[PDB]
Nucleic acid binder design. Structure first.
Ligand SMILES: Nc1nc2c(ncn2[C@@H]2O[C@H](COP(=O)(O)OP(=O)(O)OP(=O)(O)O)[C@@H](O)[C@H]2O)c(=O)[nH]1
Ligand SMILES: [Mg+2]
Ligand SMILES: [Mg+2]
Ligand SMILES: [Mg+2]
Ligand SMILES: [Mg+2]
Ligand SMILES: [Mg+2]
Ligand SMILES: [Mg+2]
Lengths: 101, 18, 208, 353, 50, 81
RNA sequence: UUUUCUACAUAAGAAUAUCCACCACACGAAAGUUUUUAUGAAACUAAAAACCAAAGGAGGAUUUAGCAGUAAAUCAAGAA
């Protein structure tokens, strides 16, 4: 079990987005190019908008990995701010400490 | 305009580059 | 307060240190100064050993300064002193030997005298009594008075000039007009003095 | 004890051991010799003292001494005054200018070249010159100063050309040049073409012994530099594109005889140059220095001890130092340090003192 | 700018293996796209969750 | 190869070369000397001091001593002492 | 007006709601309209141009902050 249904959704999304990365890239090559004619690019356009909607990366969310919180995340530990503090304050995060200066 | 010929293959085989 | 209360203010005066041997109590005093192993605050960037710097000019400079610009305010002061100077050199050569003996060309003495004339004698403080606020005549400290002078100068020559007109121009004008006591600044001083006579009875409400 | 204004005034006869003394000039002398600009700070100096007094400096002496031995048969010689900001270049150009107005030459003076390259309200288009722009205001002003500059020679010159101002107006050869000058003053529209015409006919008529031409261009770097002014397309224009500059370039080429061109390379008015660059090749660039030919690179430096003490004494004589403690040696040490005995800096420090 | 400079530059690109023929600002993106690891392929992305 | 492409300032085919040859052409036309050659003019020691001074000025850059070299070379060339 | 623009570090040149007969026009456009660009499958999102140039002429009762490298003003970077 992932902690939340939402997290589940996200796992799927990352899987699909991993699978179609090659197709998406190859097509958006054509799409993003001035050199090729527009007639290729409109077909290529429908091509990439044909692809399953959950395969596109912008639909991914970086979520807290233990607690599933959608924001207030620190990218480095993939941790919610709350869970991060909870680990660091027991000193289970090496080299992390309160800051005085 | 000007298209100049650079030989990939010559310098390739010569320098162990192909 | 990055200085502990232990730290004394520095004495920048060169004349004080150069010629010690004629004064007993002061020899004893600065003996006790350094020999006390007394810490000294580092001399500020504004203040110099310069023979040319007038602490009053510097104060005024500061009160003129908006934001962080010393460069700009020191500019405007410099320009104003130069402007008073040249205004009096103009008034000198178009005059006759008598008036050439009379007229003052030192812009510094003009600045000082014009401030001395503009400083108020007496002042007003609001005092609450029986749910009413009466304005009461109050004697003022020296510093308060000098302050009132400088602040009134600057407030007027900021406020009342026409937008085309530059600052050192208007300021040199008002300096010279306050030198001769006819300036609007001086009228303000008098408004205070008259408001202070109108209320003189209320001078009893002051408890200090 | 120091000597200041005690030099007897002879712009030509100035002696090497008279160094650092202030000779005196009249006011009508000031109106006839400098109808064009005199540096604003110094103009303030004059108007304040009622006396125009000028100190003799070593580069001015040197450049006058190269103007004594001038062989007018040889092609025009190019001189260049260079130095740090506020070191007295333009006053050293003025020394020359009035000495050579006293020998009765034709004085052509541009106070700042930069003014033609920057900040122009009206920019007019002219295809007469094959896509060139003109500056009516500037041209007019320069002409109006040039009229008062030299009157005697404006009647004497005979212009040989057929000149067309308008379809309805013209001026044909045999005319005194004054008529051309004032014909360009009156009509502001064509005043620039009038300046250019004045210039090229000056250069043509300079071969004769009737003409001794001193051409003084201050801030010559404004000629080959980069220009701020813009077309309605917002696209910037070359200095070539400017009629006034295009013609004022021809005046420096040394193609002609009887003349001398004394130039000054500037910072204070420049465009796109860094503030710390006083050196000739940096300010002039590749175009400037390459098209400037072999020239004489005269260096202008700060006051030496004697020059300095003389200037201070000159200020004390006018009682322009109003600070009580400025009469001490202390005050002199302080002014020397704070100004680094640089003339412009010293003037600034003594202005508010 | 000269023809010499442009010939030199063309030679530099061809040599070091960067883009030979002149391209738009807009088309260079293509090169970028294959120079990199596409976002959904990075281990920081598909491997994010335990 | 363009001359604006150069890493050095070579005295041959320069602009200063043409300005000097025109200056000396006009100096010879003024002195009423009918002697005219490029070999004669450019072969002199003066134009050689000008080679050295202008190549040291363009390559090395503005300097005190380099402008002293310019001073001397152009002094000699234009006959002023 | 201790301003606005350009050059440029802090000595410059110009502009300056008013000139005058007549427009035109100062400071203020962060807003809108058009066209581009970046990101993205998707532009409604951000950015740059050009046009446009409005209210605002220093603010009633009442109110906030600051004890020194502070207030004030200016510059930069980061997190997502
Ligand atoms: N009496 C006298 N004063 C001089 C002389 N040279 C410089 N000064 C003073 O120093 C100021 C310098 O003026 P400039 O001649 O314009 O100096 P500059 O080298 O042209 O300075 P920039 O234009 O900024 O390059 C003058 O206004 C004078 O007050 C001089 O020869 N005689
Ligand atoms: Mg739950
Ligand atoms: Mg997202
Ligand atoms: Mg100057
Ligand atoms: Mg506007
Ligand atoms: Mg603004
Ligand atoms: Mg797109």
């Amino acid at each position: 079990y992932y902690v939340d249904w939402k997290m589940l959704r996200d796992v799927k999304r990352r899987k699909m987005a991993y699978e179609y990365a090659d197709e998406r890239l190859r097509i958006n090559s054509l799409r993003k190019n001035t050199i090729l004619p527009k007639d290729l690019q409109e077909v290529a356009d429908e091509e990439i908008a044909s692809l399953p909607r959950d395969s596109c990366p912008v639909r991914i969310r970086n979520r807290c990995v233990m607690t599933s919180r959608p924001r207030g995340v620190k990218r480095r530990w993939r941790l919610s701010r709350i869970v991060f503090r909870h680990l660091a304050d027991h000193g289970q995060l090496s080299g992390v400490q309160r800051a005085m200066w | 305009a000007a298209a100049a010929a650079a030989a990939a293959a010559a310098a390739a085989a010569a320098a162990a580059a192909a | 307060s990055r200085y502990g209360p232990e730290y004394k203010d520095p004495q920048i005066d060169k004349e004080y240190y150069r010629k010690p041997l004629a004064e007993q109590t002061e020899e004893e005093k600065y003996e006790r100064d350094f020999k006390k192993t007394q810490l000294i605050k580092a001399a500020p960037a504004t203040k110099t050993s310069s023979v040319f710097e007038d602490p009053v000019i510097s104060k005024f400079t500061n009160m003129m300064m908006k934001g962080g610009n010393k460069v700009l305010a020191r500019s405007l002061m410099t320009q104003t002193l130069e402007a008073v100077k040249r205004k009096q050199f103009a008034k000198y050569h178009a005059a006759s030997a008598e008036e050439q003996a009379t007229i003052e060309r030192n812009p510094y003495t003009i600045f000082h005298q014009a401030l001395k004339n503009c400083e108020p004698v007496i002042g007003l403080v609001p005092i609450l009594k029986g749910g009413h606020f009466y304005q009461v005549p109050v004697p003022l400290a020296d510093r308060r008075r000098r302050f009132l002078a400088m602040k009134w100068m600057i407030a007027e020559c900021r406020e009342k000039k026409h937008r085309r007109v530059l600052m050192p121009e208007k300021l040199s004008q008002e300096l010279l007009e306050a030198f001769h006591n006819q300036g609007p600044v001086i009228k303000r001083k008098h408004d205070m003095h008259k408001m202070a006579e109108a209320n003189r009875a209320l001078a009893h409400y002051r408890w200090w | 004890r120091a000597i200041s204004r005690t030099s007897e005034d002879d712009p030509a006869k100035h002696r090497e051991q008279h160094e650092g003394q202030h000779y005196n000039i009249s006011l009508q002398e000031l109106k006839t010799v400098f109808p064009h600009g005199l540096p604003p700070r110094f103009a303030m100096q004059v108007k304040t003292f009622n006396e125009a007094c000028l100190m003799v400096r070593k580069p001015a002496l040197e450049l006058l001494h190269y103007l004594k031995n001038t062989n007018f048969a040889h092609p025009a010689v190019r001189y260049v005054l260079y130095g740090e900001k506020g070191t007295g270049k333009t006053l050293s150009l003025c020394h020359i200018l009035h000495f050579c107005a006293k020998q009765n030459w034709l004085i052509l003076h541009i106070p700042d070249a930069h003014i033609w390259v920057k900040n122009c309200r009206d920019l007019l288009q002219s295809n007469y010159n094959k896509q060139r722009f003109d500056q009516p205001l500037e041209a007019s002003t320069w002409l109006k100063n040039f009229k008062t500059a030299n009157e005697h020679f404006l009647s004497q010159i005979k212009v040989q050309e057929k000149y067309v101002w308008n379809k309805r107006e013209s001026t044909e050869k045999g005319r005194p040049l004054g008529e051309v000058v004032e014909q360009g003053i009156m009509r502001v529209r064509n005043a620039t073409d009038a300046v250019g015409i004045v210039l090229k006919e000056l250069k043509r008529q300079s071969s004769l012994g009737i003409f001794h031409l001193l051409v003084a261009v201050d801030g010559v770097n404004a000629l080959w530099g980069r220009t701020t002014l813009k077309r309605e397309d917002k696209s910037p224009i070359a200095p070539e594109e400017l009629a006034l500059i295009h013609n004022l370039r021809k005046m420096v080429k040394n193609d002609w005889q009887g003349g001398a061109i004394v130039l000054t390379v500037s910072q204070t008015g420049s465009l796109f140059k860094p503030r710390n660059a006083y050196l000739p090749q940096e300010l002039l660039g590749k175009e400037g220095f390459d098209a400037l030919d072999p020239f004489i690179p005269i260096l202008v430096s700060n006051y030496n001890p004697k020059e300095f003490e003389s200037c201070i004494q000159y200020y004390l004589e006018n009682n322009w130092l109003q600070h009580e403690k400025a009469h001490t040696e202390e005050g002199k040490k302080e002014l020397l340090f704070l100004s680094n005995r640089n003339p412009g800096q010293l003037e600034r420090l003594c202005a508010y003192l | 700018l000269s023809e010499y400079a442009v010939r030199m530059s063309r030679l530099s690109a061809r040599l070091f293996g960067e883009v030979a023929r002149p391209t738009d600002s807009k088309s260079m993106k293509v090169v970028k796209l294959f120079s990199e690891q596409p976002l959904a392929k990075r281990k920081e992305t598909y491997d994010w969750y335990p | 190869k363009t001359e604006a492409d150069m890493e050095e300032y070579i005295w041959e085919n320069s602009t200063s070369e043409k300005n000097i040859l025109e200056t000396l052409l006009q100096i010879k036309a003024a002195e009423k000397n009918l002697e005219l050659s490029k070999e004669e003019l450019l072969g002199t020691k003066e134009v050689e001091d000008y080679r050295k001074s202008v190549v040291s000025l363009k390559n090395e850059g503005d300097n005190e001593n380099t402008l002293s070299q310019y001073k001397e070379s152009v002094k000699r060339l234009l006959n002023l002492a």
